[PDB]
Amino acid sequence: GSSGSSGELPSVEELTIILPEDIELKPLGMVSSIIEQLVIIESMTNLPPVNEETVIFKSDRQAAGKIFEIFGPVAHPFYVLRFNSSDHIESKGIKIKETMYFA
């Protein structure tokens, strides 16, 4: 395939990536809160040095989205998820008390 266009969009690009059974999904944390549009995910521990560009995969091995923003301490920080709106989340199945993972 290929891609080459000159025109960005306001809404985030539905990040849909399925992870195979060869990757090890580690528990990044769990949805602690939700932003008007974005989602807040609280970490736990033993979290690797991942940057925003880092994509967060769901429990069903589905790229929920890339880190929209990170805040908090260095041991118990919180990662945010980008989403067009509340709905965008409901669909993904993300919600409070939901443990996420990364690749």
Side-chain angles (χ1 to χ4, degrees):
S2 70
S3 304
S5 275
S6 187
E8 283 69 77
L9 291 164
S11 64
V12 76
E13 194 287 79
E14 196 208 18
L15 289 161
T16 50
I17 300 157
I18 306 296
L19 209 64
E21 60 169 79
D22 199 334
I23 332 313
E24 165 177 36
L25 286 177
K26 286 150 272 189
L28 151 155
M30 164 270 281
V31 181
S32 270
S33 297
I34 285 88
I35 299 161
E36 301 194 310
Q37 38 206 310
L38 305 333
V39 168
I40 311 290
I41 306 150
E42 177 207 319
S43 49
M44 314 271 171
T45 185
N46 206 102
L47 270 90
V50 273
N51 304 5
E52 287 162 40
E53 270 79 293
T54 302
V55 188
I56 303 309
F57 286 55
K58 273 151 51 178
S59 63
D60 286 87
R61 300 210 279 287
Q62 272 162 107
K66 274 193 183 151
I67 282 151
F68 171 77
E69 170 156 84
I70 308 166
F71 57 85
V74 69
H76 312 276
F78 316 80
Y79 307 81
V80 187
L81 276 194
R82 210 174 302 187
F83 287 115
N84 304 136
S85 198
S86 40
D87 152 294
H88 208 144
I89 291 85
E90 275 202 340
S91 207
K92 305 275 181 274
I94 312 154
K95 44 73 177 195
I96 304 287
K97 313 276 161 166
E98 195 271 286
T99 312
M100 303 210 102
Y101 315 70
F102 48 58

Coordinates of all heavy atoms in Angstrom, one line a residue:
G1 N 0.8 -1.2 0.0 CA 0.0 0.0 0.0 C 0.8 1.3 0.0 O 2.1 1.2 -0.2
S2 N 0.2 2.4 0.2 CA 0.9 3.7 0.2 C -0.1 4.8 0.6 O -1.3 4.7 0.6 CB 1.5 4.0 -1.1 OG 0.5 4.2 -2.1
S3 N 0.5 6.0 1.0 CA -0.3 7.1 1.4 C 0.5 8.4 1.1 O 1.7 8.5 1.5 CB -0.7 7.0 2.8 OG -1.4 5.8 3.1
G4 N -0.2 9.4 0.5 CA 0.5 10.7 0.2 C -0.5 11.7 -0.1 O -0.9 11.9 -1.3
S5 N -1.0 12.5 0.9 CA -1.9 13.6 0.7 C -1.5 14.8 1.5 O -0.8 14.7 2.5 CB -3.3 13.1 1.1 OG -3.9 12.4 0.0
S6 N -2.0 16.0 1.1 CA -1.8 17.2 1.8 C -3.0 17.8 2.4 O -3.7 18.7 1.8 CB -1.1 18.2 0.8 OG -0.7 19.4 1.5
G7 N -3.4 17.3 3.6 CA -4.6 17.8 4.2 C -4.9 17.1 5.5 O -5.4 15.9 5.4
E8 N -4.6 17.6 6.6 CA -4.9 17.0 7.9 C -6.4 17.2 8.3 O -7.0 18.1 7.9 CB -4.0 17.6 9.0 CG -2.6 17.0 8.9 CD -1.8 17.5 7.7 OE1 -1.4 18.7 7.7 OE2 -1.7 16.7 6.8
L9 N -6.8 16.3 9.2 CA -8.2 16.4 9.7 C -8.3 16.7 11.2 O -7.3 16.4 11.9 CB -8.9 15.1 9.4 CG -9.2 14.7 7.9 CD1 -9.6 13.3 7.8 CD2 -10.3 15.6 7.4
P10 N -9.4 17.3 11.6 CA -9.6 17.7 13.0 C -9.8 16.5 13.9 O -9.3 16.5 15.0 CB -10.8 18.6 13.0 CG -11.6 18.1 11.7 CD -10.5 17.7 10.7
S11 N -10.5 15.5 13.4 CA -10.8 14.3 14.2 C -9.7 13.3 14.0 O -9.0 13.2 13.0 CB -12.1 13.7 13.7 OG -12.0 13.3 12.3
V12 N -9.4 12.6 15.1 CA -8.4 11.6 15.1 C -8.6 10.5 14.2 O -9.8 10.1 13.9 CB -8.1 11.0 16.5 CG1 -9.3 10.0 16.9 CG2 -6.8 10.4 16.7
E13 N -7.6 9.9 13.6 CA -7.7 8.8 12.7 C -8.0 7.5 13.4 O -7.1 6.9 14.1 CB -6.5 8.6 11.8 CG -6.7 7.7 10.6 CD -6.7 6.3 11.0 OE1 -7.8 5.8 11.4 OE2 -5.7 5.6 10.8
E14 N -9.2 6.9 13.3 CA -9.6 5.7 13.9 C -8.5 4.7 13.9 O -8.3 4.0 12.9 CB -10.9 5.1 13.2 CG -11.6 4.0 14.0 CD -12.3 3.0 13.2 OE1 -12.0 2.9 12.0 OE2 -13.2 2.3 13.7
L15 N -7.7 4.6 15.0 CA -6.6 3.7 15.1 C -7.1 2.3 15.3 O -7.5 1.9 16.4 CB -5.7 4.2 16.2 CG -4.8 5.4 16.0 CD1 -4.3 6.0 17.3 CD2 -3.7 5.1 15.0
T16 N -7.0 1.5 14.3 CA -7.5 0.1 14.4 C -6.4 -0.9 14.0 O -6.1 -1.1 12.8 CB -8.7 -0.2 13.5 OG1 -8.4 0.3 12.1 CG2 -9.9 0.5 14.0
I17 N -5.7 -1.4 15.0 CA -4.6 -2.4 14.8 C -4.7 -3.6 15.7 O -4.8 -3.5 16.9 CB -3.2 -1.7 15.1 CG1 -3.0 -0.5 14.2 CG2 -2.1 -2.7 14.9 CD1 -2.0 0.5 14.7
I18 N -4.8 -4.8 15.0 CA -4.9 -6.0 15.7 C -3.5 -6.7 16.0 O -2.7 -6.8 15.1 CB -5.8 -7.0 14.9 CG1 -7.1 -6.4 14.6 CG2 -6.0 -8.3 15.8 CD1 -8.0 -6.0 15.8
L19 N -3.3 -7.0 17.3 CA -2.0 -7.6 17.6 C -2.1 -9.2 17.6 O -3.1 -9.8 18.0 CB -1.6 -7.2 19.1 CG -0.1 -7.1 19.3 CD1 0.5 -6.1 18.5 CD2 0.1 -6.9 20.8
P20 N -1.1 -9.8 17.0 CA -1.0 -11.2 16.9 C -0.8 -11.9 18.2 O -0.8 -11.3 19.3 CB 0.2 -11.5 16.0 CG 1.0 -10.3 16.2 CD 0.1 -9.1 16.5
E21 N -0.7 -13.3 18.2 CA -0.5 -14.0 19.4 C 1.0 -14.3 19.7 O 1.3 -15.2 20.4 CB -1.3 -15.4 19.3 CG -0.8 -16.2 18.1 CD -1.3 -17.7 18.2 OE1 -2.5 -17.9 17.8 OE2 -0.6 -18.6 18.6
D22 N 1.8 -13.4 19.1 CA 3.2 -13.6 19.3 C 3.8 -12.4 20.2 O 4.9 -12.4 20.6 CB 4.0 -13.6 17.9 CG 5.4 -14.1 18.0 OD1 6.0 -14.0 19.1 OD2 5.9 -14.6 17.0
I23 N 2.9 -11.4 20.4 CA 3.3 -10.3 21.2 C 2.8 -10.4 22.7 O 1.8 -11.0 22.9 CB 2.7 -9.0 20.7 CG1 2.6 -9.1 19.1 CG2 3.6 -7.8 21.0 CD1 3.8 -9.6 18.4
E24 N 3.6 -9.9 23.6 CA 3.3 -10.0 25.0 C 2.7 -8.7 25.5 O 3.4 -7.7 25.6 CB 4.5 -10.3 25.8 CG 4.4 -10.1 27.3 CD 5.6 -10.5 28.1 OE1 6.7 -10.4 27.6 OE2 5.4 -11.0 29.3
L25 N 1.4 -8.7 25.8 CA 0.7 -7.5 26.3 C 0.9 -7.3 27.8 O 0.5 -8.2 28.6 CB -0.8 -7.6 25.9 CG -1.2 -7.3 24.5 CD1 -2.7 -7.5 24.3 CD2 -0.7 -6.0 24.0
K26 N 1.6 -6.2 28.2 CA 1.8 -5.9 29.6 C 0.8 -5.0 30.1 O 0.3 -4.1 29.5 CB 3.2 -5.4 29.8 CG 4.3 -6.4 29.6 CD 5.6 -5.8 29.1 CE 5.6 -5.8 27.5 NZ 6.9 -5.3 27.0
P27 N 0.4 -5.2 31.4 CA -0.6 -4.4 32.1 C -0.1 -3.0 32.4 O 0.6 -2.8 33.3 CB -0.9 -5.1 33.4 CG 0.3 -5.9 33.6 CD 0.9 -6.3 32.3
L28 N -0.5 -2.0 31.5 CA 0.0 -0.6 31.7 C -0.7 0.0 32.9 O -0.1 0.7 33.7 CB -0.3 0.2 30.5 CG -0.6 1.7 30.7 CD1 -0.3 2.5 29.4 CD2 -2.0 1.9 31.1
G29 N -2.0 -0.2 33.1 CA -2.7 0.3 34.2 C -4.2 0.0 34.1 O -4.6 -1.1 33.8
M30 N -5.0 1.0 34.4 CA -6.5 0.9 34.4 C -7.2 2.2 34.4 O -6.8 3.1 35.1 CB -7.0 0.0 35.6 CG -8.5 0.1 35.9 SD -8.9 1.5 37.0 CE -8.5 0.8 38.5
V31 N -8.2 2.3 33.5 CA -9.0 3.6 33.4 C -9.4 4.1 34.8 O -10.2 3.5 35.5 CB -10.2 3.4 32.5 CG1 -11.0 4.7 32.4 CG2 -9.9 2.8 31.2
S32 N -8.8 5.2 35.2 CA -9.1 5.8 36.5 C -10.2 6.9 36.3 O -10.9 7.2 37.3 CB -7.9 6.3 37.1 OG -7.3 5.3 38.0
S33 N -10.2 7.5 35.2 CA -11.1 8.6 34.9 C -11.3 8.8 33.4 O -10.5 8.2 32.6 CB -10.6 9.9 35.5 OG -10.6 9.8 37.0
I34 N -12.2 9.7 33.0 CA -12.5 10.0 31.6 C -12.7 11.5 31.4 O -13.4 12.1 32.1 CB -13.7 9.2 31.1 CG1 -13.4 7.7 30.9 CG2 -14.2 9.8 29.8 CD1 -13.7 6.9 32.1
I35 N -12.0 12.0 30.4 CA -12.1 13.4 30.0 C -13.2 13.7 29.1 O -13.7 12.8 28.4 CB -10.8 13.9 29.4 CG1 -9.6 13.7 30.3 CG2 -10.9 15.4 29.0 CD1 -8.2 13.8 29.6
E36 N -13.7 14.9 29.1 CA -14.8 15.3 28.3 C -14.8 14.6 26.9 O -15.8 14.2 26.4 CB -14.8 16.8 28.0 CG -14.9 17.7 29.3 CD -15.2 19.1 29.0 OE1 -14.5 19.7 28.1 OE2 -16.1 19.7 29.6
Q37 N -13.6 14.4 26.4 CA -13.4 13.7 25.1 C -12.4 12.6 25.2 O -12.5 11.5 24.7 CB -13.0 14.7 24.0 CG -12.1 15.7 24.5 CD -12.2 17.0 23.6 OE1 -12.1 17.0 22.4 NE2 -12.3 18.1 24.3
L38 N -11.3 12.9 26.0 CA -10.2 11.9 26.2 C -10.5 11.0 27.3 O -11.5 11.2 28.0 CB -8.9 12.6 26.4 CG -8.5 13.7 25.3 CD1 -9.1 13.3 24.0 CD2 -8.9 15.1 25.7
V39 N -9.6 10.0 27.6 CA -9.8 9.1 28.7 C -8.5 9.0 29.5 O -7.4 9.0 29.0 CB -10.1 7.7 28.1 CG1 -10.0 6.6 29.3 CG2 -11.5 7.6 27.5
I40 N -8.7 9.0 30.8 CA -7.6 8.9 31.8 C -7.4 7.5 32.2 O -8.3 6.8 32.7 CB -7.9 9.8 33.0 CG1 -8.3 11.2 32.6 CG2 -6.6 9.9 33.9 CD1 -7.2 12.0 31.9
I41 N -6.1 7.1 32.1 CA -5.7 5.7 32.6 C -4.6 5.8 33.6 O -3.5 6.2 33.3 CB -5.3 4.9 31.4 CG1 -6.4 4.9 30.3 CG2 -5.0 3.5 31.8 CD1 -5.8 4.7 28.9
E42 N -4.9 5.3 34.8 CA -3.9 5.3 35.9 C -3.0 4.1 35.8 O -3.5 3.0 35.5 CB -4.6 5.3 37.2 CG -3.7 5.2 38.4 CD -4.3 4.5 39.6 OE1 -5.5 4.8 39.9 OE2 -3.6 3.7 40.3
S43 N -1.7 4.3 36.0 CA -0.8 3.2 35.9 C -0.6 2.5 37.2 O -1.3 2.8 38.2 CB 0.6 3.8 35.5 OG 1.0 4.9 36.3
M44 N 0.2 1.5 37.3 CA 0.4 0.7 38.5 C 1.9 0.7 38.9 O 2.3 1.3 39.9 CB -0.1 -0.8 38.3 CG -1.4 -0.8 37.6 SD -2.8 -0.8 38.8 CE -4.2 -0.6 37.7
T45 N 2.7 0.0 38.1 CA 4.1 -0.1 38.4 C 4.9 -0.9 37.4 O 4.2 -1.6 36.5 CB 4.4 -0.8 39.8 OG1 5.8 -0.8 40.1 CG2 3.9 -2.2 39.8
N46 N 6.2 -0.9 37.4 CA 7.0 -1.6 36.4 C 6.7 -1.2 35.0 O 6.8 -2.0 34.1 CB 6.8 -3.2 36.6 CG 8.0 -4.0 36.1 OD1 8.8 -4.4 36.9 ND2 8.1 -4.1 34.8
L47 N 6.3 0.0 34.9 CA 5.9 0.6 33.5 C 7.2 1.1 32.8 O 8.0 1.8 33.3 CB 4.9 1.7 33.7 CG 3.4 1.4 33.7 CD1 2.9 1.1 35.1 CD2 2.6 2.5 33.0
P48 N 7.3 0.6 31.6 CA 8.5 1.0 30.7 C 8.4 2.4 30.3 O 7.4 3.0 30.2 CB 8.3 0.0 29.5 CG 6.9 -0.3 29.4 CD 6.4 -0.3 30.9
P49 N 9.6 3.0 29.9 CA 9.7 4.4 29.5 C 9.1 4.6 28.1 O 9.8 4.6 27.1 CB 11.2 4.6 29.4 CG 11.8 3.3 29.2 CD 10.9 2.3 30.0
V50 N 7.8 4.7 28.1 CA 7.0 4.9 26.8 C 6.6 6.4 26.7 O 6.2 7.0 27.6 CB 5.8 4.0 26.7 CG1 6.1 2.7 26.1 CG2 5.1 3.9 28.1
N51 N 6.7 6.9 25.5 CA 6.4 8.3 25.2 C 5.0 8.4 24.6 O 4.3 7.4 24.4 CB 7.4 8.9 24.2 CG 8.8 8.9 24.7 OD1 9.1 8.3 25.8 ND2 9.7 9.5 24.0
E52 N 4.5 9.6 24.4 CA 3.2 9.8 23.8 C 3.0 9.0 22.6 O 2.0 8.2 22.5 CB 3.0 11.3 23.4 CG 2.8 12.2 24.7 CD 3.1 13.7 24.3 OE1 2.6 14.1 23.3 OE2 3.7 14.4 25.2
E53 N 3.9 9.1 21.6 CA 3.8 8.3 20.4 C 3.4 6.9 20.7 O 2.8 6.2 19.8 CB 5.1 8.3 19.6 CG 5.2 9.5 18.6 CD 5.6 10.8 19.3 OE1 4.7 11.3 20.1 OE2 6.7 11.3 19.1
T54 N 3.7 6.4 21.9 CA 3.3 5.0 22.3 C 1.8 4.8 22.2 O 1.0 5.5 22.7 CB 3.8 4.8 23.7 OG1 5.2 5.0 23.9 CG2 3.4 3.3 24.1
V55 N 1.5 3.7 21.5 CA 0.1 3.3 21.3 C -0.4 2.4 22.4 O 0.3 1.4 22.7 CB -0.1 2.7 19.9 CG1 -1.6 2.5 19.6 CG2 0.5 3.5 18.8
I56 N -1.6 2.6 22.9 CA -2.1 1.8 23.9 C -3.1 0.8 23.4 O -4.1 1.1 22.7 CB -2.9 2.6 25.0 CG1 -1.9 3.7 25.6 CG2 -3.4 1.7 26.1 CD1 -0.6 3.1 26.1
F57 N -2.8 -0.5 23.6 CA -3.7 -1.6 23.1 C -4.7 -2.0 24.1 O -4.4 -2.0 25.3 CB -2.8 -2.8 22.7 CG -2.1 -2.6 21.4 CD1 -1.2 -1.5 21.2 CD2 -2.2 -3.5 20.3 CE1 -0.5 -1.3 20.0 CE2 -1.5 -3.3 19.2 CZ -0.7 -2.2 19.0
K58 N -5.9 -2.3 23.7 CA -7.0 -2.8 24.6 C -6.8 -4.2 25.0 O -5.9 -4.9 24.6 CB -8.3 -2.6 23.9 CG -8.9 -1.2 24.0 CD -9.8 -0.8 22.8 CE -10.8 -1.9 22.6 NZ -11.8 -1.6 21.4
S59 N -7.7 -4.7 25.9 CA -7.6 -6.0 26.4 C -7.9 -7.0 25.3 O -7.5 -8.2 25.3 CB -8.6 -6.2 27.5 OG -9.9 -6.0 27.1
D60 N -8.7 -6.6 24.3 CA -9.1 -7.4 23.2 C -8.1 -7.3 22.0 O -8.4 -7.7 20.9 CB -10.5 -7.1 22.7 CG -11.6 -7.5 23.6 OD1 -11.9 -6.8 24.5 OD2 -12.1 -8.6 23.4
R61 N -6.9 -6.9 22.3 CA -5.8 -6.7 21.4 C -6.3 -5.8 20.2 O -6.1 -6.1 19.1 CB -5.5 -8.1 20.8 CG -5.0 -9.1 21.8 CD -4.0 -10.1 21.2 NE -4.7 -11.2 20.4 CZ -5.4 -12.2 21.0 NH1 -5.5 -12.2 22.3 NH2 -6.0 -13.1 20.3
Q62 N -6.8 -4.6 20.6 CA -7.2 -3.6 19.7 C -6.7 -2.3 20.1 O -7.0 -1.7 21.1 CB -8.8 -3.6 19.6 CG -9.4 -4.6 18.6 CD -10.8 -4.8 18.9 OE1 -11.7 -4.4 18.1 NE2 -11.1 -5.6 19.9
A63 N -5.9 -1.7 19.2 CA -5.3 -0.4 19.4 C -6.4 0.6 19.7 O -7.0 1.2 18.8 CB -4.5 0.0 18.2
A64 N -6.6 0.9 21.0 CA -7.6 1.9 21.4 C -7.2 3.3 21.0 O -8.1 4.1 20.7 CB -7.8 1.8 23.0
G65 N -5.9 3.5 20.9 CA -5.5 4.9 20.5 C -4.1 5.2 21.1 O -3.6 4.5 22.0
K66 N -3.5 6.3 20.6 CA -2.2 6.7 21.0 C -2.4 7.7 22.2 O -3.4 8.3 22.4 CB -1.5 7.4 19.9 CG -0.7 6.5 19.0 CD 0.3 7.2 18.1 CE 1.0 6.3 17.2 NZ 1.4 7.0 15.9
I67 N -1.3 7.7 23.1 CA -1.3 8.6 24.2 C -1.5 10.0 23.9 O -0.7 10.6 23.2 CB 0.0 8.5 25.0 CG1 0.0 7.2 25.9 CG2 0.2 9.7 25.9 CD1 1.4 6.6 26.1
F68 N -2.7 10.6 24.3 CA -3.0 12.0 24.0 C -2.2 12.9 24.9 O -1.9 14.0 24.5 CB -4.5 12.2 24.1 CG -4.9 13.7 24.0 CD1 -5.0 14.3 22.8 CD2 -5.2 14.4 25.2 CE1 -5.3 15.6 22.7 CE2 -5.6 15.7 25.1 CZ -5.6 16.3 23.9
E69 N -1.9 12.5 26.1 CA -1.2 13.3 27.0 C -0.9 12.5 28.3 O -1.7 11.6 28.7 CB -2.0 14.6 27.4 CG -1.4 15.3 28.5 CD -1.8 16.8 28.5 OE1 -2.9 17.1 29.0 OE2 -1.0 17.6 28.0
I70 N 0.2 12.8 29.0 CA 0.6 12.2 30.2 C 0.9 13.2 31.3 O 1.5 14.2 31.1 CB 1.9 11.3 30.0 CG1 1.7 10.4 28.8 CG2 2.2 10.5 31.2 CD1 3.0 9.7 28.3
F71 N 0.4 12.9 32.5 CA 0.5 13.7 33.6 C 0.7 12.9 34.9 O 0.4 11.7 34.9 CB -0.6 14.7 33.8 CG -2.0 14.0 33.9 CD1 -2.4 13.6 35.1 CD2 -2.7 13.8 32.8 CE1 -3.6 12.9 35.2 CE2 -4.0 13.2 32.9 CZ -4.4 12.7 34.1
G72 N 1.1 13.6 36.0 CA 1.3 12.9 37.3 C 2.8 12.7 37.6 O 3.6 13.3 37.0
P73 N 3.0 11.9 38.6 CA 4.4 11.6 39.1 C 5.2 10.8 38.1 O 4.8 10.7 36.9 CB 4.2 10.8 40.4 CG 2.8 10.1 40.2 CD 2.0 11.1 39.4
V74 N 6.3 10.2 38.5 CA 7.1 9.4 37.7 C 7.0 7.9 38.0 O 7.4 7.0 37.2 CB 8.6 9.8 37.8 CG1 9.1 9.3 39.2 CG2 9.4 9.1 36.7
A75 N 6.3 7.6 39.1 CA 6.1 6.2 39.5 C 4.6 5.8 39.3 O 4.3 4.7 39.1 CB 6.5 6.0 40.9
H76 N 3.7 6.8 39.5 CA 2.3 6.6 39.4 C 1.6 7.6 38.5 O 0.6 8.2 38.9 CB 1.6 6.6 40.8 CG 2.4 5.8 41.9 ND1 2.2 4.5 42.0 CD2 3.3 6.2 42.8 CE1 2.9 4.0 43.0 NE2 3.6 5.0 43.5
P77 N 2.2 7.8 37.3 CA 1.7 8.7 36.3 C 0.4 8.3 35.7 O -0.1 7.2 36.0 CB 2.8 8.7 35.3 CG 3.5 7.4 35.4 CD 3.4 7.1 36.9
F78 N -0.2 9.1 34.9 CA -1.4 8.8 34.2 C -1.4 9.1 32.7 O -1.0 10.2 32.3 CB -2.6 9.6 34.9 CG -2.5 9.6 36.4 CD1 -1.7 10.5 37.0 CD2 -3.3 8.7 37.1 CE1 -1.6 10.5 38.4 CE2 -3.3 8.8 38.5 CZ -2.4 9.6 39.1
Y79 N -1.8 8.1 31.9 CA -1.8 8.3 30.5 C -3.1 8.6 29.9 O -4.1 8.0 30.4 CB -1.2 7.0 29.8 CG 0.1 6.6 30.3 CD1 0.2 5.9 31.5 CD2 1.3 6.9 29.6 CE1 1.5 5.5 32.0 CE2 2.5 6.5 30.1 CZ 2.6 5.8 31.3 OH 3.8 5.4 31.8
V80 N -3.2 9.5 29.0 CA -4.5 9.9 28.4 C -4.7 9.3 27.0 O -3.7 9.1 26.3 CB -4.6 11.5 28.3 CG1 -6.0 11.8 27.8 CG2 -4.3 12.1 29.6
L81 N -5.9 9.1 26.6 CA -6.2 8.5 25.3 C -7.0 9.5 24.4 O -7.9 10.2 24.9 CB -7.0 7.2 25.4 CG -6.1 6.0 25.7 CD1 -7.0 4.7 25.5 CD2 -4.9 6.0 24.8
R82 N -6.6 9.6 23.1 CA -7.3 10.5 22.2 C -8.6 9.9 21.7 O -8.6 8.7 21.3 CB -6.4 10.9 21.1 CG -6.7 12.2 20.5 CD -5.6 12.6 19.4 NE -4.3 12.6 20.0 CZ -3.2 13.0 19.3 NH1 -3.3 13.5 18.1 NH2 -2.0 13.0 19.9
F83 N -9.7 10.6 21.6 CA -10.9 10.2 21.1 C -11.8 11.3 20.6 O -11.9 12.3 21.2 CB -11.7 9.4 22.1 CG -11.1 8.0 22.4 CD1 -10.5 7.8 23.7 CD2 -11.1 7.0 21.5 CE1 -10.0 6.5 23.9 CE2 -10.6 5.8 21.7 CZ -10.0 5.5 22.9
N84 N -12.4 11.1 19.4 CA -13.2 12.2 18.8 C -14.2 12.7 19.8 O -14.4 13.9 20.0 CB -14.0 11.6 17.6 CG -13.0 11.0 16.5 OD1 -13.3 10.0 16.0 ND2 -12.0 11.8 16.3
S85 N -14.9 11.8 20.5 CA -15.9 12.2 21.5 C -16.2 11.0 22.4 O -15.6 9.9 22.3 CB -17.2 12.6 20.8 OG -18.0 13.4 21.7
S86 N -17.1 11.2 23.4 CA -17.5 10.2 24.3 C -17.8 8.9 23.6 O -17.3 7.8 24.0 CB -18.7 10.6 25.2 OG -19.6 11.3 24.4
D87 N -18.7 9.0 22.6 CA -19.1 7.8 21.8 C -17.9 7.0 21.4 O -17.8 5.8 21.7 CB -19.9 8.2 20.6 CG -19.8 7.2 19.5 OD1 -18.7 7.1 18.9 OD2 -20.8 6.6 19.1
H88 N -17.0 7.6 20.7 CA -15.8 6.9 20.3 C -15.3 5.9 21.3 O -14.7 4.9 21.0 CB -14.7 7.9 19.9 CG -13.7 7.5 18.9 ND1 -13.2 8.3 17.9 CD2 -13.2 6.2 18.6 CE1 -12.4 7.6 17.2 NE2 -12.4 6.3 17.5
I89 N -15.4 6.3 22.6 CA -15.0 5.4 23.7 C -16.0 4.3 23.9 O -15.6 3.1 23.8 CB -14.9 6.2 25.0 CG1 -13.7 7.2 24.9 CG2 -14.7 5.3 26.2 CD1 -14.1 8.5 24.3
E90 N -17.2 4.6 24.1 CA -18.3 3.6 24.4 C -18.1 2.4 23.4 O -18.2 1.2 23.8 CB -19.7 4.2 24.2 CG -20.2 4.8 25.5 CD -21.7 4.9 25.5 OE1 -22.3 4.9 24.4 OE2 -22.3 5.1 26.5
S91 N -17.8 2.7 22.1 CA -17.6 1.7 21.1 C -16.4 0.8 21.4 O -16.6 -0.4 21.6 CB -17.5 2.3 19.7 OG -17.9 1.5 18.7
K92 N -15.3 1.4 21.6 CA -14.1 0.7 21.9 C -14.3 -0.2 23.0 O -13.6 -1.2 23.2 CB -12.9 1.7 22.2 CG -12.7 2.7 21.1 CD -11.8 2.2 20.0 CE -11.5 3.2 18.9 NZ -12.6 3.2 17.9
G93 N -15.2 0.1 23.9 CA -15.5 -0.7 25.1 C -14.7 -0.3 26.3 O -14.7 -0.9 27.3
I94 N -14.0 0.9 26.2 CA -13.2 1.4 27.3 C -14.1 2.0 28.3 O -15.0 2.7 28.0 CB -12.1 2.4 26.8 CG1 -11.4 1.8 25.6 CG2 -11.2 2.7 27.9 CD1 -10.8 2.9 24.7
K95 N -13.7 1.8 29.6 CA -14.5 2.4 30.7 C -13.7 2.3 32.0 O -12.6 1.7 32.1 CB -15.8 1.8 30.8 CG -15.8 0.2 30.7 CD -15.2 -0.4 31.9 CE -15.2 -1.9 31.8 NZ -14.9 -2.6 33.1
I96 N -14.3 2.8 33.1 CA -13.6 2.8 34.4 C -13.4 1.3 34.8 O -14.2 0.4 34.6 CB -14.5 3.5 35.5 CG1 -14.7 4.9 35.1 CG2 -13.8 3.4 36.8 CD1 -13.5 5.8 35.2
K97 N -12.3 1.1 35.5 CA -11.9 -0.3 36.0 C -11.6 -1.2 34.8 O -11.9 -2.4 34.8 CB -13.1 -0.9 36.8 CG -13.7 0.1 37.8 CD -12.9 0.0 39.1 CE -13.2 1.3 39.9 NZ -12.7 1.1 41.3
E98 N -11.0 -0.6 33.8 CA -10.6 -1.4 32.6 C -9.0 -1.4 32.4 O -8.4 -0.3 32.1 CB -11.2 -0.8 31.3 CG -11.2 -1.7 30.1 CD -9.9 -1.5 29.3 OE1 -9.8 -0.5 28.6 OE2 -9.0 -2.4 29.4
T99 N -8.4 -2.5 32.6 CA -7.0 -2.7 32.5 C -6.6 -2.7 31.1 O -7.1 -3.5 30.3 CB -6.5 -4.0 33.2 OG1 -7.1 -4.1 34.5 CG2 -5.0 -4.0 33.3
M100 N -5.6 -1.8 30.7 CA -5.1 -1.7 29.3 C -3.7 -2.3 29.2 O -3.1 -2.6 30.3 CB -5.1 -0.3 28.9 CG -6.5 0.4 28.9 SD -6.7 1.6 27.7 CE -7.7 0.8 26.5
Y101 N -3.2 -2.4 28.0 CA -1.9 -2.9 27.8 C -1.2 -2.3 26.6 O -1.9 -1.5 25.9 CB -1.9 -4.5 27.6 CG -2.8 -5.2 28.6 CD1 -4.2 -5.0 28.5 CD2 -2.3 -6.0 29.5 CE1 -5.0 -5.7 29.4 CE2 -3.1 -6.7 30.4 CZ -4.5 -6.5 30.4 OH -5.3 -7.1 31.3
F102 N 0.1 -2.5 26.4 CA 0.8 -2.0 25.3 C 1.7 -3.0 24.6 O 1.8 -4.1 25.1 CB 1.7 -0.8 25.8 CG 2.5 -1.1 27.0 CD1 3.4 -2.2 27.0 CD2 2.3 -0.4 28.2 CE1 4.1 -2.5 28.1 CE2 3.1 -0.7 29.3 CZ 3.9 -1.7 29.3
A103 N 2.3 -2.6 23.5 CA 3.1 -3.6 22.7 C 4.5 -2.9 22.5 O 5.3 -3.4 21.6 CB 2.5 -3.9 21.4

